[PDB]
Design a protein around this nucleic acid. Structure first.
Ligand SMILES: [K+]
Ligand SMILES: [K+]
Ligand SMILES: [K+]
Ligand SMILES: [K+]
Ligand SMILES: [K+]
Ligand SMILES: [K+]
Ligand SMILES: [Mg+2]
Ligand SMILES: [Mg+2]
Ligand SMILES: [Mg+2]
Ligand SMILES: [Mg+2]
Ligand SMILES: [Mg+2]
Ligand SMILES: [Mg+2]
Ligand SMILES: [Mg+2]
Ligand SMILES: [Zn+2]
Lengths: 53, 108, 50, 86, 143, 154
RNA sequence: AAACGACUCUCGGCAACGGAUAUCUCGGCUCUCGCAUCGAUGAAGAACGUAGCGAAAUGCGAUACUUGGUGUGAAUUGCAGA
RNA sequence: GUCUCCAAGGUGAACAGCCUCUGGUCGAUGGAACAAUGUAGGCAAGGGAAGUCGGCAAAAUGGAUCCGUAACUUCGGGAAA
RNA sequence: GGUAGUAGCAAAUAUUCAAAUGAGAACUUUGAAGGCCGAAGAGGGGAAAGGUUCCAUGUGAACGGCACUUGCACAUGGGUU
């Protein structure tokens, strides 16, 4: 699957560059299941999407 | 069979006069061919940590000698063409160093 | 551009509506000769020249 | 530099759509159409271009009103009447 | 020179309208059969006969013909060998054919009795400064 | 459909074909020429070796500027050969289709051999290139029709 | 030993490439005849819309592939519904 | 080819060159070898323009501080002589 | 048609390892590493010009001068307060 949309939305939500977005490689299916900024925020809260330092 | 060994690989002589921009990828290919020759397995998988070690000093400064562990395992996947595959990982360097270190058998 | 006149915008709307394939049921009409939309336009191939 | 480099500078429209004939022939600075000579009252037409004349002559359009004239002439422009009730 | 300068500029005249066999052309260089004449045998070392060693009357150091570290790309000479003046055809390890002279050797150079005074046995893989490994070890204090 | 060559005994033969295949006609012809009159199993092994770069297809007619290799020595003395993997894959697929047809017919595959195989030029497809001084040149492909018929030995 | 094969060339069967030939034609060209009817009561031309399902052509104007009268007399039709 | 706004740290006189942070990106079809001839970039003992139409090309010089600076001159310069 | 599977694919430093999907992965996505742009940028917006190229989903054929699971291509929908 492709997570380009998730990467873009995570970058926008975290207010960081796309190169500072970390998508958990072991949570690919559940990350791809998200298609809205609300789902992205929920994933960030759960810890599957992290802003890198 | 399932056998694990530890080898010392002389990458210096294998990559003598290698073009700078291809030196580390050539080292990766060199290690793959070394594992193929040593274990008889076409399919060789290089550990991410070993790749990190090879690339740790850039694309030019490949280490002269590298201590690796090669393990031959049976491929569980049925759709795999090869029955066995080789896994190459880093190996611990003794305190005395690489001097006097030969090929060793790891499996108990 | 972002700044555009109302007339130009309406003309572009008409061009967008006209840029589409023909309905499938057109090909089944008795004594039909239309095979496809011969006037299809792509924004990169032919410019409108407005 | 008079070729490819020069072609890179094209973003000022000499002509825009003409109000009357709809062509992209309305010279903005001259404020006049090079195709139909709008806003001049008379249409621009010349005998040395028969093709140009036949591209825009009467009949190439809709003839909203003119198309119905022959029927009215055939009826003698009968008006203010209807067929006998059934 | 446009189009390169490592060429023959003119490879022939208009007539004859052909390139001749006498014009230099690019092609295979080296690996040609050759026969070189008048090479003088400076010594004949016989294995195990106090002539294989590089010792001379002047220099009495006990050393063998093989230089320090071995002959580069060849190895250690242990069988009979010939020491010939000058160079010979081919790279190291090449098999060469030794032929008896077809001419009558009567010149002074051919008749000269050469007496070797010193034979260098230093390493040829660098700027060798020792004639023997024992000498090097004595110099560096390891023996 | 009518093939260029019909089998002597159709009951003991199968056929396969493909039209307008997007592969180079000259390479495909070289591969077919290499394959003619070979047993089916040997042809399969030869094509697999060609794909693995272990055996080479000798380039014989369309060979101007082709390199030379030692792999094609036994077939072509001059050594002009290549490894047209695309053509080999397409011909192998056609051979697999023919083998499936033989299995449906009830023939035994052990003694099957390529009785006939032919490559023809199909309709050329058009693209273009851009040349110096504002010029445009053709950029064409050369698809081919392929047909083959397998027969029972003896 | 210049044989078998490869290449080139040539002839024949078949298969390709291409669209000539033949037979057609709701089109064109030419001649002849009848009639005299655009527009400020807004012409020709130009734009935008309009069908259950249409982009073009054709038609039409928010009553928008048509309203109404009259004639004929059981369809339209690619599909669906009335 | 096509107008314009924003503009971090280090070195350094400096939006010079070089490296780095935010942001972006590895997009230029790939693999093997390292022949000749080329394209681009270097070095070369002794001599030093003998080469060539011609020092073409390249090399040499180069920042800063101190000392010092001729002919000529329109008295301003020359001069970074 | 021969030319000919020939001339060519070479500017802008560079890719590598593991995994996921897929019939098919050097070229798609994730992670890790090694590099570049180096703020008068290969970053972030506008003017003209273009006109839906914007966003989501899916993809036979063609096209993206190799390839593609892909997309500024194609098909269906949405979007400019
Ligand atoms: K060749
Ligand atoms: K024939
Ligand atoms: K009516
Ligand atoms: K000179
Ligand atoms: K002169
Ligand atoms: K797929
Ligand atoms: Mg005006
Ligand atoms: Mg030496
Ligand atoms: Mg070109
Ligand atoms: Mg005809
Ligand atoms: Mg400073
Ligand atoms: Mg600035
Ligand atoms: Mg998009
Ligand atoms: Zn006009």
């Amino acid at each position: 699957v492709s997570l380009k949309l998730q990467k873009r939305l995570a970058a926008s939500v975290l207010k960081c560059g796309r190169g500072k977005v970390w998508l958990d490689p072991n949570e690919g299916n559940e990350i791809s299941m998200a298609n809205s900024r609300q789902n992205i925020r929920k994933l960030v809260k759960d810890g599957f999407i992290i802003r890198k330092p | 069979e399932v056998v694990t060994r530890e080898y010392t690989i002389n990458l210096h002589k294998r990559l003598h006069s290698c073009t700078f921009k291809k030196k580390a990828p050539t080292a990766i290919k060199e290690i793959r061919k070394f594992a193929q020759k040593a274990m008889g397995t076409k399919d060789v998988r290089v550990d991410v940590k070993l790749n990190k070690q090879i690339w740790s000093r850039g694309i030019r400064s490949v280490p002269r000698r590298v201590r690796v562990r090669i393990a031959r395992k049976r491929n569980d996947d049925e759709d795999a063409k090869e029955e066995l595959y080789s896994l190459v990982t880093v190996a611990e360097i003794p305190a005395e160093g690489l001097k006097g270190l030969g090929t060793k058998i790891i499996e108990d | 551009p972002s700044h555009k006149t109302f007339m130009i915008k309406k003309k572009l709307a008409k061009k967008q509506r006209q840029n589409r394939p023909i309905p499938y049921w057109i090909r089944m009409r008795t004594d039909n000769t239309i095979r496809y939309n011969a006037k299809r336009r792509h924004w990169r191939r032919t410019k409108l020249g407005f | 530099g008079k070729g490819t480099g020069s072609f890179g500078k094209r973003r000022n429209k000499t002509h825009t759509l003409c109000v009357r004939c709809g062509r992209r022939s309305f010279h903005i600075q001259k404020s006049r159409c090079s195709a139909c000579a709008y806003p001049a009252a008379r249409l621009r037409k010349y005998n040395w271009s028969v093709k140009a004349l036949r591209r825009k002559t009467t009949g190439t359009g809709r003839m909203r009103y003119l198309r119905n004239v022959p029927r009215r002439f055939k009826t003698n422009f009968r008006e203010g009447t209807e067929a006998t009730p059934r | 020179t446009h189009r390169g300068l490592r060429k023959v500029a003119c490879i022939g005249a208009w007539h004859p309208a052909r390139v001749s066999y006498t014009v230099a052309r690019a092609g295979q260089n080296g690996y040609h059969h050759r026969t070189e004449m008048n090479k003088k045998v400076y010594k004949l070392g016989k294995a195990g006969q106090e002539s294989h060693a590089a010792i001379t009357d002047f220099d009495r150091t006990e050393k063998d013909i093989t230089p320090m570290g071995g002959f580069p790309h060849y190895g250690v000479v242990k069988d009979d060998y010939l020491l010939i003046k000058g160079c010979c055809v081919g790279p190291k390890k090449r098999v060469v054919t030794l032929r008896q002279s077809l001419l009558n050797q009567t010149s002074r150079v051919a008749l000269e009795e050469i007496k070797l005074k010193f034979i260098d046995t230093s390493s040829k893989f660098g700027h060798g400064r020792f004639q023997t490994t024992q000498e090097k070890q004595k110099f560096y204090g390891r023996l | 459909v009518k093939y260029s060559k019909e089998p002597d005994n159709p009951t003991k033969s199968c056929k396969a074909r493909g039209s307008s295949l997007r592969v180079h006609f000259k390479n495909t012809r070289e591969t077919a020429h290499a394959l003619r009159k070979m047993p089916l199993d040997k042809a399969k092994r030869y094509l697999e070796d060609v794909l693995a770069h272990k055996q080479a297809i000798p380039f014989t007619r369309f060979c101007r500027g082709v390199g030379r290799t030692a792999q094609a020595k036994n077939r072509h003395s001059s050594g002009q050969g290549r490894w047209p993997v695309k053509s080999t894959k397409f011909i192998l697929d056609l051979l697999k289709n023919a083998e499936s047809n033989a299995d449906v017919k009830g023939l035994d595959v052990d003694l099957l051999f390529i009785s006939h195989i032919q490559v023809n030029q199909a309709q050329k497809q058009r693209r273009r290139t851009y040349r110096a001084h504002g010029r445009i040149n053709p950029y064409m492909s050369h698809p081919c029709h392929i047909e083959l018929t397998l027969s029972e030995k003896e």
